[PDB]
Amino acid sequence: MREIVHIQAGQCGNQIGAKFWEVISDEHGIDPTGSYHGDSDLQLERINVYYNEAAGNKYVPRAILVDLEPGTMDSVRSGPFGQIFRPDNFVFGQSGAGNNWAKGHYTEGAELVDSVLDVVRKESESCDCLQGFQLTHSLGGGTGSGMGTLLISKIREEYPDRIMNTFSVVPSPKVSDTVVEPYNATLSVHQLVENTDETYCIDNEALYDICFRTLKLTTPTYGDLNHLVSATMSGVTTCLRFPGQLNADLRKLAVNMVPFPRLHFFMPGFAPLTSRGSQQYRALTVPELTQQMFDAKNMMAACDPRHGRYLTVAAVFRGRMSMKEVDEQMLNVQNKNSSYFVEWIPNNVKTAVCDIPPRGLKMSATFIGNSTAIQELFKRISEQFTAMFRRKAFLHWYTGEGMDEMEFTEAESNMNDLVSEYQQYQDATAD
Amino acid sequence: MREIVHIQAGQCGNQIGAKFWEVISDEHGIDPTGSYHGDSDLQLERINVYYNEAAGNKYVPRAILVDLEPGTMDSVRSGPFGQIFRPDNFVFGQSGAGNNWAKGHYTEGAELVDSVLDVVRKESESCDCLQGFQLTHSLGGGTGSGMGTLLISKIREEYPDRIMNTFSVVPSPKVSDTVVEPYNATLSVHQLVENTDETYCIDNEALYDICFRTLKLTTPTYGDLNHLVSATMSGVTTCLRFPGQLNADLRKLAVNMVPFPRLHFFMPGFAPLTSRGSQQYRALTVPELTQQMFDAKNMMAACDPRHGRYLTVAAVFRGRMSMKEVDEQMLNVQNKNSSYFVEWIPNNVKTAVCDIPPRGLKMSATFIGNSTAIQELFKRISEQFTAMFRRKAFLHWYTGEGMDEMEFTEAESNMNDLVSEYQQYQ
Amino acid sequence: MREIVHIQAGQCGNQIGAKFWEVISDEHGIDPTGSYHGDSDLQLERINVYYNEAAGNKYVPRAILVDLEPGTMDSVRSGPFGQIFRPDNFVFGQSGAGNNWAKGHYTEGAELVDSVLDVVRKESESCDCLQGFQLTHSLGGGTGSGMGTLLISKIREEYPDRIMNTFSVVPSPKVSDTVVEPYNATLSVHQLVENTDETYCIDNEALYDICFRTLKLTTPTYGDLNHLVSATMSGVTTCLRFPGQLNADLRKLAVNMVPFPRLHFFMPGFAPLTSRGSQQYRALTVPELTQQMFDAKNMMAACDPRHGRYLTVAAVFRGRMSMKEVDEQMLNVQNKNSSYFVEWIPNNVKTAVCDIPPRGLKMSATFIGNSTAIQELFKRISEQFTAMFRRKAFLHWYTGEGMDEMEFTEAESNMNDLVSEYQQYQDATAD
Amino acid sequence: MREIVHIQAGQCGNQIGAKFWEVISDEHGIDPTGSYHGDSDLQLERINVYYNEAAGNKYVPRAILVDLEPGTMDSVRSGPFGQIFRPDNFVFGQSGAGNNWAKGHYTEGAELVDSVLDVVRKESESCDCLQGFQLTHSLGGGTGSGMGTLLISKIREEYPDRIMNTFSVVPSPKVSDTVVEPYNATLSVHQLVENTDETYCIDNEALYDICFRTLKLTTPTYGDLNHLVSATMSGVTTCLRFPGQLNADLRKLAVNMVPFPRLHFFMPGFAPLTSRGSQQYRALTVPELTQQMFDAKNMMAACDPRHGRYLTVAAVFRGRMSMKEVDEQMLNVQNKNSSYFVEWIPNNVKTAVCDIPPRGLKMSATFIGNSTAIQELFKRISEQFTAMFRRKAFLHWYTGEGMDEMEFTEAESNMNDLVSEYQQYQ
Numbered sequence A, C: 001m002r003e004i005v006h007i008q009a010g011q012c013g014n015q016i017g018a019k020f021w022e023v024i025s026d027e028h029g030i031d032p033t034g035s036y037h038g039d040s041d042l043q044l045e046r047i048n049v050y051y052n053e054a055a056g057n058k059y060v061p062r063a064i065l066v067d068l069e070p071g072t073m074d075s076v077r078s079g080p081f082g083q084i085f086r087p088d089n090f091v092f093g094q095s096g097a098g099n100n101w102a103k104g105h106y107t108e109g110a111e112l113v114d115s116v117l118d119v120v121r122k123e124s125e126s127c128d129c130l131q132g133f134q135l136t137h138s139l140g141g142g143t144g145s146g147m148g149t150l151l152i153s154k155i156r157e158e159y160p161d162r163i164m165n166t167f168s169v170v171p172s173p174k175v176s177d178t179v180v181e182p183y184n185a186t187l188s189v190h191q192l193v194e195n196t197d198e199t200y201c202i203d204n205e206a207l208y209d210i211c212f213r214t215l216k217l218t219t220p221t222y223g224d225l226n227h228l229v230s231a232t233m234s235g236v237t238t239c240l241r242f243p244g245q246l247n248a249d250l251r252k253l254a255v256n257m258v259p260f261p262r263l264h265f266f267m268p269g270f271a272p273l274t275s276r277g278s279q280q281y282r283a284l285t286v287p288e289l290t291q292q293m294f295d296a297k298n299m300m301a302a303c304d305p306r307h308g309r310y311l312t313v314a315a316v317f318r319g320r321m322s323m324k325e326v327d328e329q330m331l332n333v334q335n336k337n338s339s340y341f342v343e344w345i346p347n348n349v350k351t352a353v354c355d356i357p358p359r360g361l362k363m364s365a366t367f368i369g370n371s372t373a374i375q376e377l378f379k380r381i382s383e384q385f386t387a388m389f390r391r392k393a394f395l396h397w398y399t400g401e402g403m404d405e406m407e408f409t410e411a412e413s414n415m416n417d418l419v420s421e422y423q424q425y426q427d428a429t430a431d
Numbered sequence B, D: 001m002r003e004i005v006h007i008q009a010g011q012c013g014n015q016i017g018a019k020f021w022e023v024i025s026d027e028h029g030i031d032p033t034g035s036y037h038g039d040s041d042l043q044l045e046r047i048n049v050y051y052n053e054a055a056g057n058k059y060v061p062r063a064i065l066v067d068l069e070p071g072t073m074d075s076v077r078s079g080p081f082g083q084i085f086r087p088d089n090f091v092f093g094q095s096g097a098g099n100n101w102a103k104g105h106y107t108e109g110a111e112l113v114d115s116v117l118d119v120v121r122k123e124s125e126s127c128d129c130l131q132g133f134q135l136t137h138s139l140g141g142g143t144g145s146g147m148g149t150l151l152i153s154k155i156r157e158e159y160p161d162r163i164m165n166t167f168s169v170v171p172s173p174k175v176s177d178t179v180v181e182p183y184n185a186t187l188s189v190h191q192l193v194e195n196t197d198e199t200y201c202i203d204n205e206a207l208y209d210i211c212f213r214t215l216k217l218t219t220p221t222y223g224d225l226n227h228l229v230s231a232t233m234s235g236v237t238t239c240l241r242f243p244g245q246l247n248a249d250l251r252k253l254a255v256n257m258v259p260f261p262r263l264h265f266f267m268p269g270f271a272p273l274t275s276r277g278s279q280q281y282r283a284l285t286v287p288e289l290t291q292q293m294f295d296a297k298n299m300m301a302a303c304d305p306r307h308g309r310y311l312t313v314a315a316v317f318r319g320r321m322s323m324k325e326v327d328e329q330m331l332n333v334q335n336k337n338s339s340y341f342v343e344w345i346p347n348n349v350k351t352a353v354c355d356i357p358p359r360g361l362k363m364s365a366t367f368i369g370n371s372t373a374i375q376e377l378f379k380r381i382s383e384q385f386t387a388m389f390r391r392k393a394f395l396h397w398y399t400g401e402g403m404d405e406m407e408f409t410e411a412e413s414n415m416n417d418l419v420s421e422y423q424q425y426q
Ligand SMILES: Nc1nc2c(ncn2[C@@H]2O[C@H](COP(=O)(O)OP(=O)(O)O)[C@@H](O)[C@H]2O)c(=O)[nH]1
Pocket: A009, A010, A011, A012, A013, A015, A016, A097, A098, A099, A138, A140, A141, A142, A143, A144, A145, A169, A176, A177, A178, A204, A222, A225, A226, B245, B246, B247
């Protein structure tokens, strides 16, 4: 019924989406060949949310892979679960963006966007009732940032009422993996704040902090980070696929989480997360899930939520639970820690409970927080962008692709307006 | 997907290119006869980046050999891996350069550049998507400097949007191997600063220092210096050939590394480098690679980076690693040694991680630093150029080949303007 | 219901706490793997006093281990019962205090106290009804003294009405194991007298005297001393865990034992204690327990109670007993030896009787005496501190950590005030 | 957790350090090749205190060798356990010290200290938590005295809060091995009393007395004196490596032992020491260890402690023991011999008990005494220094290297002030 078109863009985003499809196919009992070998009847009851049936009991993921270089495409094709994707959906150029937003947004992505949109339209025509779109990409890259923003603009133009969800990997506060990361991030945010319904802020540095501090991993690979991001992704759209005591689709989350049209950048989280050894010392109760969810050191975005206030909070639980216990924990958190929630919104937390827990767990819960502490991320990116743009650092690389400097000025102005709005709404007396 | 055309010009350029192709053929399992005898599918998955497939299960390096004298080409053709190149790509004249930039750029190189460009265009037509070119040459000689700068100008005119990379051997601060090195070096920089995308500064003085202090080599010949240079060359383009956790090809490296169009002169480095005796006493960890990379005594350019400040830094790692450990080491380096980085650029270091280590190593990492300390090289070259030009020393050898004093004055002015810019951003 | 948070600090204190948890797990039938393999139903009826259940019938001790050096932590992890502790509760630095109170209290312990308090808050949130806290440490050391006093101050600030009990190892009268023991002891007492509800004075020298004189041990190890201290610890909180004819929790003992807010330093004791051979010559009757309890040579604090008067006395018995016999013995002791009890307090002895004796015994009894003879300990420590401070002996080691000399003066003044108070209340005519 | 960097400077320092590393490698089961062949998990549980793990199941001692002459280093490298050190840590010059403090401190040591400090910082960066440094050197020579004092000053400036321990061989009261021992000794104490945390006074005279009277050795070479010194060195830091009933690391030892910042010169001792013949006639009990420890004829410093009074006393025991027996013996010693302890410090002796005895022994104990009787050493050194300086004997050899008479006067004044303090507290 309610179907989601997943779009992969860039190395940082498509590389996640591969792990995401691994996890999703594991949840629904679909082996790396597309054949169904599950046990529970509920696995195929809502299988069409992500999977088209391919006339012979093979299920094909409704996914579209976009990049400007075929290397990541070959890597995805050769790896595990690379044989379930439809070969027609691997749309890729030959040049590559080179971490240049202007390039990937105006020349190479502009040449490839027509084929990408043809594939998107073909996937949307095959649907029963299109719920929305799902994009995975990074903000500080090339293909990812520019190509994803271009695709979001195009699709928002074509489908104005569908849901546009993006899981964006944001720049890290300490270590940057791209020398021009501020420009790409600022331009990508300027494009995102105008077209997306909700966007999730994944920060790699926070993911390494979680892997070392909580999971006690000494050698964490990108498999683990992509697995955490994919667990978040699966927890988001769980209510669309399995029944539960309280259902909450993407639109319900968007309504309950976005108070004003521009404040839609969320801090995702996940629980439970334990090391391999500490499993035998932790009982799994709803209070434990609640304690780990509302934890600053558990956020996947490198922004301390204790430095701001929560506008809205989504808490999607999974597994057999008591509604009284979940409601009790939410209310106790709101009452005991009232100094961290926005005053002019009563009942800040949205609650959803599903019946089917993730693979191997008795129960879990996905945290989605809309906190004003994301102004830290935005202000840091704005200050770095100003420091680099004042000297025109590497500005010629973007002006040589036909991009205007006034466009950079407008993007900086929009970023600062978003920062000022986030600051305006926190610490605003409800009187 | 992406393909590279390699052009090697000069005696030094041909030697470094022969060693480079030996190393590259070893990485992809291509024996000296062109046959493939590897053991991993990744070796053939992206082999077309450097190799054209001549039907018959044989691969031919997409390399073009340029020289004004046939001796170096004969030595290259007769040696090991000399039978792997295409015989049509040995484009050489008969006159010789004579370590004269004027000669090699206006008379002999001008007579040979038409055939060289014919070969270049033929090689370019056989690609699916041309990524860019690489020029291996030295700035001290006649064929290298003049011929390579002429070829760079011609190709930049023909291909204005492709990546132009050059691996230039720069004059040494202690002992020159050519009496007229300042003239050739200045006249070559006058073209390189205008036509190239990124230039890697390699100095034989720093290579001898590495081979002696670090590798503990009693008798290092050029077979080892060229091997170090080839290790750098292979580490630069490892993201175009093998998969990894975080990719960064030539275009993205040039984007992250060059803040302003004229400041594109880099200091390459490599780690790990250990002697055979000290090999059993050193644990190979990512912090060790990070410590050896950002080391002044490990730079392949004879310029102390501690006398300047880093604009941008590239750190391409190879082998199974953790993203978190690499990022933590980069952040520790940026924080603890913040006084050597320009304050107007946050997060100077841009990293990349490949999943395939070099042959025989568990892991390694190539350092590419764009430091303002490179202004010392240009200041020394400009001082020597002025000292020689104020007395017209060896000047008739260049004015008798078609040049004039106005061109030398313009080259000196461009060199000094580059110096002034590098000092301005420090 | 009533739960206790045990906190281990320092080598001298954590080293006890290991033996304490061995004994407690033996009493409740919990093997070194956390599994329950007891016999009596009463062992699990009040198991939550010390143990959190870990979702699978494994019980985890509600203990927190604190030190400034990981050596003792590794020793505890590797030894027996080291696998029942939760790995998240091993909070340790890297430097070490070096028997410097100023260091461990102001720099290293100050750096570690935030993590320690986070663990403490997490343990307190999981409780049903927090009764109080329990600290085991030494006064003449580094991590022990300074770190424990800092933790006591922090927790007293956060939880002002909970019970703060500390089992402190005090300096010995003859042999000192630390050259700077007077300074650490004086500063630790200055901090303790202001925040703790009751503190027990364990002296090693008295423990060797008991081991040689009474137990007839020729080669007593710290296993035996820690075992005696742990037997005392278990006898203190027995009424909170097993039923009895007279129940007396920690708060009842604190009320009946501390007449004035500053006089809360107790002299613990234990009975019966016999050698291996003399067991066949001693009948175990309540009069025998009473005779051994009120014995100066049986005190675990190296202070002769015959040199002072008893303000209050606690006598917690264990095992099947006649109430008439216990009351008769208490009354006979008060009447025949009236010259050793404070005149202005009638009925100096508090009586508590539990039904379950310790492991292997038919019955026992724990002595807790609040005698004015502890002024001997305090006056000796004050005189040694004065003798060392007059010459500024090793004072630079503490002033180099940012500590003020006026703070030493204040600590000495408070110590002397405590001595003067103890002397004021004894030999004070009740007329 | 805690880690130590060992620095050995001079011929005497290098010999003692080689023997020390032999003993330490024997304790942790590390064979001369670096491979681990122990039989107890406790050997590897805290092996990182002295050993860096070079990946490959090999351990490398965290030791730095310093000398101004390559002969001693060649002898160390060629001998047994010479292959266990890292080859990069042999930092040596070519000139030689010549038993001249001025030379080794201002010219040759000054030329070498930059490389030595580079190695020191490299070793320090590889630790989790640096506990402190140990310097093994002699006060009579040129490399030892001058180079070690220079290194101590440099490191104290770089690391102001780490534990600086030195194991100094002091001049003998009967026969000097260098004609200018007073000058070097005074100029070295002038730095040691200012920059170190604790200094252990070892005298070869007392070591010969021990080897003859106690061990009944007819022909004791330095292979035995260095073994005694190494036994002391290993007993000092045994609480950092093996668990025990009562721990006391370097920081707590320095806290308990040094009452005033300048009185940090200790008299090390060791027990049990028995000949092979008398071994079958002596029962090994804790009272026997206590009796042999507090014995004037057992002190490794040639100063009779019965002529002074003890400020503080450290007694680190090793092996399975009873806390009560050790405490009773300490109390008996303090009570029966109360006239040798300062009355203004109660409970002078601070003890520590480790659960692992030395190799081959059931139990042992290391004595560390801070006695005011050490003023005899400084009085003798000051008398000899004054007698030589009043006539400018051998003075030109030090003034021709950059020193002046003002510096000698200041060193003499500092020595005499230390003497005056030690007498003041007696
Ligand atoms: N979490 C995660 N982040 C990644 C991964 N690969 C790359 N990144 C991040 O993405 C950024 C690089 O952008 P990238 O997407 O590779 O450039 P693009 O391909 O041109 O869009 C860096 O900051 C990396 O930290 C991955 O597999 N997982």
